[PDB]
Amino acid sequence: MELMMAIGYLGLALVLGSLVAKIAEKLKIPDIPLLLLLGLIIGPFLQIIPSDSAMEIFEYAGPIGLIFILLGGAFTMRISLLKRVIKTVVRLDTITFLITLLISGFIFNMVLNLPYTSPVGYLFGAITAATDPATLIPVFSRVRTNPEVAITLEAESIFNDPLGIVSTSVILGLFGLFSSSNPLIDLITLAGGAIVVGLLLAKIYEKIIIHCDFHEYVAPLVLGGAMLLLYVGDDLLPSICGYGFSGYMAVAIMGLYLGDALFRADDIDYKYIVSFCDDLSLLARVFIFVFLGACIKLSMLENYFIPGLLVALGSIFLARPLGVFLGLIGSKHSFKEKLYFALEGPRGVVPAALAVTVGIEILKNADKIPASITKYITPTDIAGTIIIGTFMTILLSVILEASWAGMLALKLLGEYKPK
Amino acid sequence: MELMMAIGYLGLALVLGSLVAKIAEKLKIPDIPLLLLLGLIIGPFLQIIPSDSAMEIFEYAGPIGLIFILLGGAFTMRISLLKRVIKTVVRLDTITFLITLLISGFIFNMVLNLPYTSPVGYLFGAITAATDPATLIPVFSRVRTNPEVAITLEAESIFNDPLGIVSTSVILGLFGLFSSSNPLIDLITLAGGAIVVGLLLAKIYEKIIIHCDFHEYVAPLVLGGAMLLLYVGDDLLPSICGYGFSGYMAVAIMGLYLGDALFRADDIDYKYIVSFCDDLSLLARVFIFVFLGACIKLSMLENYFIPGLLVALGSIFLARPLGVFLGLIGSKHSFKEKLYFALEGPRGVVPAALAVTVGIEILKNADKIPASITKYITPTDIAGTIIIGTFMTILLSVILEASWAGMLALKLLGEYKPK
């Protein structure tokens, strides 16, 4: 665990990563594939980090990294704003999200030939359903859409954030359950709890900021404040109850409300935040993608390469696209938004940790207690697949979206000519 | 080691600390005493953290924290610039520094009544001699001196940085030695090595930055690059040789050269760096002072309260002031610079870690192997004292300097009337 090694490797990551990111900025190309390639080079190719070690580092670093990008993603944008294309945004985001997860459960189960009740398939499907913004919707969205869509993508992103947790709970229930007591209270408690206290601080922050003085001192407040939300949510309240409120959704809600409350007010106290959050959110994303890669255990992969690839294509081309086409149908229009609903595959911040976290949770405790469910299916490959599918999942979703985003941003000027 | 607790406590530190720092900015008062008071409140008073735990966290966090403030301190200023009052600055900084350490060795030994050859006293004296800038010379120096003195204070700060390490080596030699092989190569190897590679990157950085493109991407480069310097210096090269170059002096030299090389060139690529480094350097200093406090083991303190207090007064009033008065004597002038040489007691970033690091190193390995030197003196109190003396040391040096800095900045306009 030698510290000097940790700061050394972290140093190499910052030095090489900053340079590569800058080259990308002067190259137009989007970060993510370059981040993954770097992850391979310092990963399998040069053998600079193994699986066990990568996962061990990630157990500590990941929550810190995740708090960074969630905070960075929130501040790089706003709210109020969101309420005009919003009917489509909420119906499509919520209803199409649940349907996509359902689609994910079924194909993943069938391709393996494993039983439908079996939970591994439904987990894989659950991972596909989750979106993640923060790595790519905010990074391309620095520059305009300018219509509806940027706000929605943010909303979709965050909207899931209340969804990804719900999906994780569902996956926990059916793949066997550590606790069978609630299939419903946990949904309430996490979302509702995160909403209440998040609004509590956003309101508190709203008043305290407007009355005075920090300005500048507002940054430690949320960064420590967000930190407390995790401690209260996933450690303190489960300890004192088994009753927790999560934390992640709670900080998401706080950022969502607070950004709007700040922006809504106007005045001198807004410029600076966009640049600061963009710079901050960059280091974490570079580090997270590579560290997300290194967290996975070393040797994944040979057996489940083909299925995960096949599962991925179903999510990108069938589940995603059917979702948008069957979730927007009442639109105008068109041929620009419904297609956007399709192609999904942006999330990768949530499900990633959850994929790996579930992987260690079931695989390690397997010998000690694997709820005796889906053992002979056999899971060994469930844990293995999820990670590649998400990898593959990021790469192809990220690569394709990055390649056609400009074409789908301007090329689709809606051809609306009113005179 | 539960992560959620770590990010939770860290979160509380950021939230409360940012607010307190902002209040201070709107209050004029200087951070440091407030940081120490907070450290007490979450320390002994409320029992939020113990010694063992605080030191355990500090072993990991401290090198990360130390890299932050060293980098922040460098960028908040420049170089080239330093070369006009510089004769006084180098003679006073170097020659008065060694003399101060010598003074520290003697009084500390005598007050205990322990033997002069005995190394514990010379360690205590060594700790007094070390200065540390970064926490208070840069923080007050955001606003002008405007003469000579700000540049010197920076130089004194950094100049020691090559000195604090030398002092630590000297302390290691005489308080018993793990290795008796070199009392001279280590001085060369650390300083010389840090100089060479530091200049290597500063030159490399100088060319690569001027030719292109990062701008913004220069921040990861040094932050990872600085990280590698620690790994190469205090882990890799000692492992592959027993031959190390430190790292800290090396990153200090790199920052010193690079800041000047960047500033010397001029052009659009300088604004932004001052604000960025100031903001970055703040979080670390708040966290470092409180975390420096929490690193020390719980129960220090009752036996050696009085001596450390007495040792402190000798350093502040006798060793410091004799040093400046006997180190400047050839000045003009006057009654404004010689007095500044006196009052010392600003350092607290280096000796702190070194104080605690030596404390664990000798106290823990004592039963296993305490080089059998100064055991019956007895050390138990050496380790205990150093920490309080440095605490006391920061508080009184920081409090007094902060109180009279304005008076000594303008009140001493040199009364120079040339016509």
Nearest-Cα residue of chain A relative to residue B15 = A221
Secondary structure, 3-state, chain A: CCHHHHHHHHHHHHHHHHHHHHHHHCCCCCHHHHHHHHHHHHHHHCCCCCHHHHHHHHHHHHHHHHHHHHHHHHHCCCCHHHCCCHHHHHHHHHHHHHHHHHHHHHHHHHHHCCCCCCCHHHHHHHHHHCCCCCCCHHHHCCCCCCCCHHHHHHHHHHHHHHHHHHHHHHHHHHCCCCCCCCCCHHHHHHHHHHHHHHHHHHHHHHHHHHHCCCCCCHHHHHHHHHHHHHHHHHHHHHHCCCCCCCCHHHHHHHHHHHHHHHHHHCCCCCCCHHHHHHHHHHHHHHHHHHHHHHHCCCCCCCCCHHHHHHHHHHHHHHHHHHHHHHHHCCCCCCCCCHHHHCCCCCCCCHHHHHHHHHHHHHHHHHHHCCCCCCCCCCCHHHHHHHHHHHHHHHHHHHHHHHHHHHHHHCCCCCCCCCC
The answer to whether A224 contacts B13, with C-beta atoms less than 8 Å apart, is yes
Choose the closest CB to B4 out of A16, A217, A234: A234
The answer to whether A63 contacts B18, with C-beta atoms less than 8 Å apart, is no
Chain breaks in chain B (C to N over 2.5 A) after: 144, 212, 213, 214, 333
The answer to whether A5 contacts B213, with C-beta atoms less than 8 Å apart, is no
The answer to whether A63 contacts B229, with C-beta atoms less than 8 Å apart, is no
Choose the closest CB to A216 out of B22, B219, B227: B22
| Token pair 């208070």 in the structure block, residue | B136
CB-CB neighbors (< 8 A) of B8 in chain A = 227-228, 230-232, 235-236
Secondary structure, 3-state, chain B: CCHHHHHHHHHHHHHHHHHHHHHHHCCCCCHHHHHHHHHHHHHHHCCCCCHHHHHHHHHHHHHHHHHHHHHHHHHCCCCHHHCCCHHHHHHHHHHHHHHHHHHHHHHHHHHHCCCCCCCHHHHHHHHHHCCCCCCCHHHHCCCCCCCCHHHHHHHHHHHHHHHHHHHHHHHHHHCCCCCCCCCCHHHHHHHHHHHHHHHHHHHHHHHHHHHCCCCCCHHHHHHHHHHHHHHHHHHHHHHCCCCCCCCHHHHHHHHHHHHHHHHHHCCCCCCCHHHHHHHHHHHHHHHHHHHHHHHCCCCCCCCCHHHHHHHHHHHHHHHHHHHHHHHHCCCCCCCCCHHHHCCCCCCCCHHHHHHHHHHHHHHHHHHHCCCCCCCCCCCHHHHHHHHHHHHHHHHHHHHHHHHHHHHHHCCCCCCCCCC
Question: CB count, 10 Å around CB of A189?
Answer: 17
Determine the Cα–Cα distance for residues A406 and A395; give it in Å rounded to an integer. Answer: 18
Nearest-Cα residue of chain A relative to residue B278 = A216
Enter the tokens of residue A291: 């560290």
The answer to whether B25 contacts A232, with C-beta atoms less than 8 Å apart, is no
Nearest to B385 by CA among B313, B314, B312, B318: B312
CB-CB neighbors (< 8 A) of A219 in chain B = 18, 279
Choose the closest CB to B7 out of A7, A10, A67: A67
Determine the Cα–Cα distance for residues A343 and A397; give it in Å rounded to an integer. Answer: 7
The answer to whether B60 contacts A12, with C-beta atoms less than 8 Å apart, is no
Determine the Cα–Cα distance for residues B96 and B325; give it in Å rounded to an integer. Answer: 9
Domain range for A375 is 1-419
Nearest-Cα residue of chain B relative to residue A15 = B221
CB-CB neighbors (< 8 A) of B25 in chain A = 213-214, 216-217
* Contact residues for A281 (Cβ-Cβ < 8 A; gap 6+): A68, A69, A71, A72, A73, A76, A134, A138
Determine the Cα–Cα distance for residues A108 and A103; give it in Å rounded to an integer. Answer: 9
Enter the tokens of residue B62: 């401290």
Nearest-Cα residue of chain B relative to residue A25 = B214
Whether residue B140 contacts residue B402, with contact meaning beta carbons closer than 8 Å, is answered with: yes
CA distance B229 to chain A (A): 7
CB-CB neighbors (< 8 A) of B273 in chain A = none
Whether residue A302 contacts residue A384, with contact meaning beta carbons closer than 8 Å, is answered with: no
Domain count for chain A, please give it: 1
The answer to whether A11 contacts B213, with C-beta atoms less than 8 Å apart, is no
Determine the Cα–Cα distance for residues B365 and B265; give it in Å rounded to an integer. Answer: 50
Q: What are phi and psi of A296, to 5 degrees?
A: -65, 140
Cα Dmax for chain A: 72
Q: In Å, how far are A81, B15, B228, B254, B336 from B158, measured between CA atoms?
A: 50, 31, 20, 11, 22
The answer to whether B11 contacts A216, with C-beta atoms less than 8 Å apart, is no
Determine the Cα–Cα distance for residues B403 and A316; give it in Å rounded to an integer. Answer: 65
Choose the closest CB to A18 out of B4, B63, B220: B220
* Contact residues for A286 (Cβ-Cβ < 8 A; gap 6+): A13, A17, A20, A21, A31, A35, B220
Determine the Cα–Cα distance for residues B355 and B108; give it in Å rounded to an integer. Answer: 15
Determine the Cα–Cα distance for residues B103 and B303; give it in Å rounded to an integer. Answer: 23
Cα Dmax for chain B: 72
* Sign of the CA dihedral with B90 first, then B96, B98, and B100 last: negative
Nearest-Cα residue of chain B relative to residue A27 = B213
Whether residue A273 contacts residue A89, with contact meaning beta carbons closer than 8 Å, is answered with: no
Whether residue A377 contacts residue A112, with contact meaning beta carbons closer than 8 Å, is answered with: yes
Determine the Cα–Cα distance for residues A408 and A141; give it in Å rounded to an integer. Answer: 13
Q: In Å, how far are A398, B145, B333 from B417, measured between CA atoms?
A: 69, 18, 13
The answer to whether A228 contacts B18, with C-beta atoms less than 8 Å apart, is no
CB-CB neighbors (< 8 A) of B16 in chain A = 224
Q: In Å, how far are A62, A237, A250, B391 from A231, measured between CA atoms?
A: 14, 8, 12, 30
Cα end-to-end distance, chain A, whole Å: 69
* Contact residues for B101 (Cβ-Cβ < 8 A; gap 6+): B125, B126, B128, B129, B167, B170
Question: CB count, 10 Å around CB of A390?
Answer: 28
| Method used to obtain the model | electron diffraction
CB-CB neighbors (< 8 A) of B17 in chain A = 220, 224
CB-CB neighbors (< 8 A) of A234 in chain B = 4
Enter the tokens of residue A206: 């709203």
CB-CB neighbors (< 8 A) of A251 in chain B = none
| Token pair 């390490």 in the structure block, residue | B165
Question: CB count, 10 Å around CB of A299?
Answer: 11
